[model samples]
Target: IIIATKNGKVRGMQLTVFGGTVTAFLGIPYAQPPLGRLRFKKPQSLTKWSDIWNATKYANSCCQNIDQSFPGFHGSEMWNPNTDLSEDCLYLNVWIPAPKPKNATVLIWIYGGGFQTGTSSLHVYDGKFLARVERVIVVSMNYRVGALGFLALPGNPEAPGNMGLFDQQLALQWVQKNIAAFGGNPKSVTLFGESAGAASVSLHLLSPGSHSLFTRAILQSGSFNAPWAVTSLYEARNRTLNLAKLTGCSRENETEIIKCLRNKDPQEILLNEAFVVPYGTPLSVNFGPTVDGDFLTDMPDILLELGQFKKTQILVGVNKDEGTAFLVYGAPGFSKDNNSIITRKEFQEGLKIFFPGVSEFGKESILFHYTDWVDDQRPENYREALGDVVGDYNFICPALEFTKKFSEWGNNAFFYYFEHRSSKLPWPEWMGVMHGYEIEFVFGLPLERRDQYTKAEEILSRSIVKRWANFAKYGNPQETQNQSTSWPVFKSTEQKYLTLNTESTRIMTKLRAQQCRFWTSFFPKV
Candidate 1:
């Protein structure tokens, strides 16, 4: 299939899925390549082309170092970028059902790698199954990550932070201007993402440049207000200066520093990603989204509180065990193969590293809150306790805060709690529904590989795909669900949400009742 985009006409490939076909238009350039002088700058819009462009091949991923920490683990290997890595990596892909539906709903995906690493072409993110089964158009884009995407100079507009976010806004703009040519409704687009991608989705809601690009959002396991999503300008500048020193770009001026850094090899910049963080703390990364005065005017919390954001219907949720992945990979000495128990003293020390700036009293309060008081004797339970702390502080509570504010402003909001564990993956049994576990199910992977997944798993996958797509097509996900499975609207007081699992996919309320209260209500007071 061939379609004409504003840039040029592009050819797409068609493939057969379960019982039908979906056409895939891969690696369509959404912006001018961020190479040479364009490095560390906001993406430039592309000009029109004279000849047809072949977009059937996957494009380059932004430069990032491979994760060598937990070798041979399914969790580590699954999210790695499979495409060749390069500096010139700004592209988007689209998938539409064969005999494309007119003005079909559009779903755009932003991937998560802590804003440091990720690609849109990962196997788990394949849009064919969702496009075919849900009869919706699916699109994914590859944006710059790490220092290349977010290197902030205090007063330099040329090297403003949040370039990756600008990349996303540009793609959203591309969709608004050109999606109709592919038989998609520009007015009904839904922007959705996981982890950092989810944070990006929420940031778009609060950004002026992103207004009117999409009408709805789905944030999976991440929010813009998450503690680590956006670093302070002071911290971002220090990190950039430290990064320059590490990369042999020790110039006195910001402009000269950026010039020298841009001329250095891209691999050298990524190699120094770990050094910018003070004392090699695993709890945070050096480069990520920051509050640039232009893209993000103010702090996310303050902006949301002032109602300075777009009022779009939103669906947001987190996994049952969102922190186990971080705990295993991020803790000073812990991994699936390491097999060592977490001691109480080690737990306190870990918290000290995680909370670098908290006061002693506040630290003790946090420790007291996260501890399993009655079962405090066992080393095994400490691991789970710490997991709860990390997950609650980083993913769960912040998401609740965002949704709570969204509901306060008279926008319809839907909430969910995912508890289903994937049976195919080789992750440890204790890592229940870890981060990114729901991606395959949301993409309808179980339906495609019925021989490998159980009957119940496939049904659950189908239900979620329908619910997600229904939310995109109509404002309500309940449009596709039966009376018994109807999801409730999430308001501030009621706090209603749906529990997604295999046997009993039912509505629930007050997720992490006390834990969320401790973080959202009490912890801030301290």
Candidate 2:
């Protein structure tokens, strides 16, 4: 098949899905290669293209900090080291069902790896099923990752950080201009993703330049309030230099150092330059998006609280065990006292991770809330307690706060707290409904053997697809995949939400009742 895009004519392939064929225009360049001078800088728009560009294959993934050499990690969460990757990886893939609708709803997915590792080509993220099942045009794309994507150096023009975000914006602009060619409504684009990608989607809501690019958003299990999402400008500059020091770029002037970095290998920077925060810390990465005085005017929580964001309808939620995903990633230390197990001794000696500056009264209160002291502070018990603490402090609490603030403005928004667990990836005794467990369900992809899946799981997947499809089609998620229960809009007081449970859909409320009240008292909302 041929797709006559505004840039030029492109060849695509017909993919089989649900007993029908879907046209896949893969690896279409949305922006010029961010190579050489454009490496650390924002992406530039492309105006020219070949007469017939072959887009059958996916482009190389953006340079990322994924180490396949690490033994335990596998599959979609991390990219394979053997796969081809490059700095010239500003590309997107589209899945259009044949006999396109006059104006089909479009779904734009931004993958998550904490802005450090993720690719658009992951089989788990393939839009073939969604495109065929929901009949919505699905588009996924790659952006710069690791330091290359987000290395904010304060007042420097060479590296103003957020280059990856700029790449995303350029791709969105491309969609607005050319999606009509492939049969899509320019006015109906829903930006959605999980984990870091979810956080990125919310950030776009706050980014002034990102206004009018998309009409709706779905943030799954991550928000700008998650401690790991942004850093101080000082920390941003320090992290940049810290990563630069690994490659010997720290000895020279700032401009000279960045120029030196641009000349070096992308893999070198990804492998050695990236900085992951210590285990048990509130944040995951030491470096990521920062409060750049220009792009990001103020704190993300502050912006959302003040309703200082793009006024778009939204659906945001988090997994039951959002923190276990972070806890299980690091080495075995996460098991014993090495990392995961936060002992009484550790906390009593002034906790360093999430709750640092607690008064004597605060210290006792913190320990009482997280620890299971009633039974015994065994190693396993401590580990279990640690996961919950991190999840509440990072994922759960902040998500509730964001939704409440958005609801205050009477802007249409929906929220959910995921509790369903899939059978495909068996959870350990300590793990339950970890972060990103909803991706496959949301995509309508299989998690395990069809026969192995619980009947409820099938129903749950079906129901979510209907709501998501409706969300893409109309501004609100009205009809669920099944059931008469209407997806409720989260109002100011009622605080009602649709729970994506396996057995039956339910409208649950009062997100973290006790924890939220205590947290509000601990820290000022301002």
Candidate 3:
């Protein structure tokens, strides 16, 4: 089937097997490929084409190495095999429920990869099931990854850091212009992502350029409260220079340095430079969304606190065992043997640098308070602290704090805790509801895989998809018979939140209350 878009007429495939009522458009270019001279530049508006553009297979992912030892890179499978590796990888795919247009809701997905690797073609991202099940239009996009996408360069007046963010803005613009043809209501678009994608969506909500681009947002497993959320131009430049030095690209000669980098293979860049340690070496840190003067004006938490957002409905949450996955990947001193240590000197030293105000008493107190869990017979307990701290600093705290401020702004805000554990893996008991486990359920994937689905999971999945789609339709997640509990608006006084567990669904007052208070005090302004 061929549909005419503002840019041009494009070809799409219709799937009749999955209830035969959904039309899918895969691998549609939203902008001209960002290759050659265009590399490292902001995405350009796509030029109109005369021919029927094929939207079949997935597009090439942005420059990345799949083998990096990261939390989300385990058991990797390449999503696209044919497209050549290059900077020209900004693309998006769409799935719309069949029938005459009636302003169906639209959901835009951003995949998680710690700001480095991911594509729209991941099996978990297939929206056909969601489209058919929820009767809404879904769109997933691909943007630049790794250095090519997030490289912070030395003062080159032409462009600054956060080129990857600009790519997202361009994709949203494409949705605005062409989504109507896919039976989606351009005005009713909800932005959603997990991990880095969730972080990006949170960042986008704070961006001036992203204003009015999305009407609602869902942030799963990540938010925008990390130390690296915003970086100064000088800091970004220095980091870029550091990377250049590591790769032997020079800072003195701009043209030559760029040429040398351009000549280097994408895989080589990722292989040598993709690991990010929290509160560790600067160069080893993952390049993140930079605070370029234009794309990102301020940190999201700060911006939201100051009443500087477009007032959209929000759904934010974290997985129960987010840290298990990271621990399984193995970290120094994180093995079973060292689980009894009171506190690693390295961790305490790093904390002092990152968290300057803690008194010696408070520092020792925190370690002592958490010591039992760290030394618990179960290695999973030791691992939980990593997720707890990271989650507190990056995901949970941000969502809680954002909700605190946003509630005062007269906008609708809902928070959730996803605690559904998978039983299929070798050590399922050890991996209780680990990170990214919600992917298959949200996509309504078949229950063929063991531990992939349960009666409660199916109910929760359908409720979430419907509620998310409903929010897109009307900017609020309301309780229906399908949902387990009545969605409550977050309030400063009560701090009521939804707890999505397998055995029981209930509302908890100020859940993770102590951690929330700690973060609130730690980041007073945010």
Candidate 4:
């Protein structure tokens, strides 16, 4: 099948999946490559092309660092880019259901790698099953990551930060203009993603460029209010200057700095730009979104409070054990000898390290609130409590706060807690539904590998896919086919949310109510 895009006509091939046919067009360039002179600049629109473009295979991923420090890490192999890495990667993939129906809903996916590493070409991100079974047009795009995508050059109009976000906005505009050619409804687009990708989706709600491009959004386990999701513009600028100094390109002027940095090898910059945190401190991605007076005008929390964002329908959620993966992989001090256990002394020390800037009274308050008094005898209790502290502060509480404020501002909002743990995962049982675990089910991976997953997983994955499609198609996730529970709209007074699992999928209320209140109201005051 050949579809004519604004730039050129692209050819796609048909794929058979789960007894249905879907046409997939891969590696479609939506903008000119940000190479050489274009590096660190906003994406430029592509000019018209004369010949038909062949878009049957994936393209190169944006340059990023490959972790060799943790040689035998559990999930490293699954996420690092599998294709060639380069600076000239600005492509997108489209999956359209066969027997084309007009006005089909559109679901656009943005993969997360903490703003450091990610690719749309990963095996798990394949959109074939979702396109065929759910009967929606699925689109995923590749954006620049790390310093190449987000190095802030403050006071320089041409090189202001958030270039990666500009890449996404351009792709969204491309969809608005060209999606109808593939039988997709431009007005019914739903933007969704996980972790850093989810944070990106939330930032889009506040970005002026993205307000008219999508109608609905889904954020999984990340919010713009999360401490690590964003950095101050000055901080971002300092990081860029530090990178320049480290790479022998330090200059007094922004133009000279950019020119010198552009001449160096991309791989050399990626390797040298690594940011290290003090021992026991929370891990953060150095190069990420910043308020550049354009993409973002103010902090996300302040903007939400002042009602300065586009109000649209949204679905927000977090995993049950949101911090388990970070503690295990990023923080070696907490988990000793690969054993998921933290002693009481270690827990006490962790509190001081995690909250270095807090007042003594504030640290004492957190210590008292987090210690498991009832289960003091069990060593694992400390580990569990520590995970809860990190999770609530970083992922869980921020999501609740974002949704709560969004709901109070008169926008339709849906909230959820993903509590299902896959048996096929290689991690230990204690890492209960760690971060990014729900992506497989959302993409209908269980249905694709029926023999590998259990019957319960198959049923759960189908329900989730249907509900997600329903949200994109009808702005709400409730479907009459599975009438056991109705997903309710979130309100500030009631704080209702859904607990998603295989056997006990039902509506719940006040997820981590007191803890979130403390984090939002009390902690910041001190």
Candidate 5:
């Protein structure tokens, strides 16, 4: 099947079944190829073409080295199969389920890769399963990555920063203009993502350019208050200048510098540039969105505090062991063999870096409070503390704070914790439900990928997928057939949360109460 758009025609694979119809469109270009002279500029509408284009093949991804060291974190080599990397990569894919009619809900997915390396082509993200199972349109997109997408160079007024964001906006605009042709209701679109993608969704809620583009949002394992949440332009410019110096490109001559950078091999740029991590560089030199005042106003926290966020329903949650992924694949962290013990001094130092202006008594109080949980005798316990710190400081706390403030605006907010474990992995024994373990279940990938769980787990997955689909249709997840217990709406006073654990699902009246209060106080009032 093929549909013509303002730009080139897009080809899709259609599946006809009794339930409804299913359409999978891949590699559709939403913007003109951002290459050569237009490299860093805001994405432009793709040029019109007469021929029907085959979208079955995935397009080239933004330049990046495929990382395969961490099994739990990286999954499999098949995750990043598309090896072709280029700057001319701003494509999107769409999956529409049967019975093509007007007003069907739409879901736009933003993948997670620490804001550096991820694409819409991963097999795990195949929307066909979700569409067939949930009966809705699903969309996944690929924006620029690494230096090609987020480099914040000085004197580049035409394209200051946040090229990736501009690309996303262009894709959303395409949806608004053409989704109806695919039997979708543009007005019912819900934006969602995990990890860095989740952060992007958070930013879009506060970005004026993205205002009204999405009716609702779902953020998983990422939050609006992460260190990269709001970075100063001055800091970004300094990093860009440093890169130019590292590459020996003369900053005095903007034209030559741009020319030199474009001519340089993409692989070299990815390999030479060190990737950014949480609690590290604010302006991820090789990869991260820039705070270009035009697109991004202020820090998202400030915008949300000022009640400047778009009034949209939100579903946000964090995994039980979200930070384990970073520890295994990312920078320095505690070892699994050493009883996972981190000295109080070491923990306090790390906490001080994240939470500035805390009295020693406060630190001692926190340590004493979680002493049982952070005992050195059990190495996994220490790992759990590390995970909690990373998750809470960077994601959980911020999400709670955002929910607390946003709930006051008369919009509904729901929170959950993904604690399901995989039997195939060394987890549950070595570690709890690690990061990204929920992706397979949520997307309902191959059963082999998931642990040999009972039919109840499968039902849970179905329930989650259906709930997410329903959230796209309506602003609320409760509107769907979530067979499990009712997910309660989060309230500042109740401080309740849904815990999605292995044994049974339950509600914690005040989950992480102290930590939530501590983080709330840490962040300056919006």
Candidate 6:
């Protein structure tokens, strides 16, 4: 497939799947490489080129610790993304349906890696099947991460923190400018992502330049209120200062510190001790889209409640077990079985980390609601309590409040509780529907794995694709597979939501109402 771009012409391969072909143009640069002097600076537009470009393969992934060999420290993403690491990774991929339709739907995906690591090149991220089956254009972008993405310095220009988001903003501009040429309706795009990527979609809604770019958004397993989404400027600077000293940069001068850190080896900056976010506790992160005032008008939590952001048709949801992956991360010698037990001491400390400055009353309330002491606190029962506490506090509860808040402000908000887990998946049996487990179903799967899908899962995949594609085409995701019962849009009055599982969509008036009420009282800011 060959298409002429504003810059130049590029050739791509057509993916054959589900009895149709989708053209995939990979590795298109969305921003100038953030290396050398550009490091830590807001991303600039990519210069136009006269030469014909080759976008047949994925480009280098952003610089970070994505290596799978690193235990308890690598991307705990849905799959093992085997892509190269390089600073020149501000790229986006486009998968389009053949020929052209004036109103072809578009979805721009942002891959999540805790704002520090991720790649858009993973095979699972391949947009072919989704584009082919749904007849929509799918775009995924790779933004800078870690210190390179969100380092806020007082003396720096823009006092920048959300360089990664600026990278995304530039990509969206490119999409609006170029997606029309690829048989897509730029004005009808649906921005969606999982984990940190979901948080990115949420932040973009609050951001000044982003709300107009997409008509809708889908946040899976994450939200602005998620505990790991953002950090305070003070915390970000403190982390940056420590990272500078670890890399032998000046800890005092902001300018010199940024320069020295930029000049250091990429691996050294990425693998430094301070850069390591030992996962397992509170689901905390060192850096992300922080409160830099310039990119983020204010803290996302505050911005969301104040209704200071753009309102659009939005879908937000969480996997049943949102914290199973993060619980054992960064801890050696702790596997699924042994790590199940959480002592009262561990739970209390984790609560402090998750909800800082909470009263003793609030902390004990969380423990009391989640833990049923009458039941034997064995591994099986213990994990339920453990996973629920982390999931509700960090993801489920936060996402619920975000949905309600968005709806209260007088806009369409769709909510779902994804409860599907497949036997064929590589995840542990007990890790049911953990964070990011829904990506494969959200985007259609590879033909290679056709036989691996169970009867229920195969149907489940189709059901999800239909709903998501419909959402992208229209502002609302309307019906179930048979078009039997309609999915109700969330309203402050009903507080209704859909339960997405293997069987079918069902109406639930509310989710974890008891636990959610407890959390809402305890952490209003979340």
Give me the candidate number with maximum lDDT: 1
C-alpha root-mean-square deviation, each candidate: 1.7, 3.4, 4.2, 2.0, 3.9, 3.0
lDDT of each: 0.87, 0.76, 0.69, 0.85, 0.70, 0.77
Model 6 quality (TM-score): 0.92
- The model with the greatest TM-score is 1
Ranking by TM-score: 1, 4, 6, 2, 5, 3
Looking at model 1, which ten-residue stretch has the lowest summed lDDT? 475-484
**Candidate number with the higher TM-score (1 or 6):** 1
Clashes per candidate, residues 3 or more apart or on different chains: 0, 0, 1, 0, 5, 0
Error of 3 at 526 (Å): 16
Q: 3 or 6, which is superior by TM-score?
A: 6
Off-target runs (Cα >4 Å) in candidate 5 are 15-21, 71-83, 253-256, 275-286, 330-379, 424-429, 446-453, 479-483, 522-526
So what's the TM-score on candidate 5? 0.87
- Pick by TM-score: 1 or 4, better one: 1
Model 6 poorest ten-residue lDDT run: 273-282
Evaluate candidate 5 by giving its C-alpha RMSD to the native, one decimal.
Answer: 3.9
Which residue pairs show collisions in model 6?
A: none
Expressed as tens digits, the lDDT of each residue in 208-254 for candidate 6 is 88877888989998888876788877777777777877778865667
Return the lDDT, model 4, position 312. 80
For candidate 3, list the clashing residue pairs, or say none: 34-88
Q: Tell me how far the alpha carbon of residue 375 in candidate 3 is from the true structure, in angstroms, after superposition.
A: 11
Write the residue-wise lDDT of candidate 2 on 136-193 in tens digits.
8999889887788888887787898878877888888889998999999889999998
True lDDT of residue 141, candidate 6? 92
| Deviating ranges (above 4 Å) for candidate 2 | 67-82, 251-253, 274-283, 330-365, 372-381, 426-429, 447-452, 523-526
> In angstroms, what RMSD does candidate 1 have relative to the true structure?
1.7
Candidate 4 — worst ten consecutive residues by lDDT sum? 275-284
lDDT of 6 at 260: 81
**lDDT for position 29 in model 5:** 83
Model 6 root-mean-square deviation = 3.0
TM-score for predicted model 3 compared with the true structure:
0.86
Q: Comparing candidate 2 with candidate 4, which one achieves the higher lDDT? A: 4
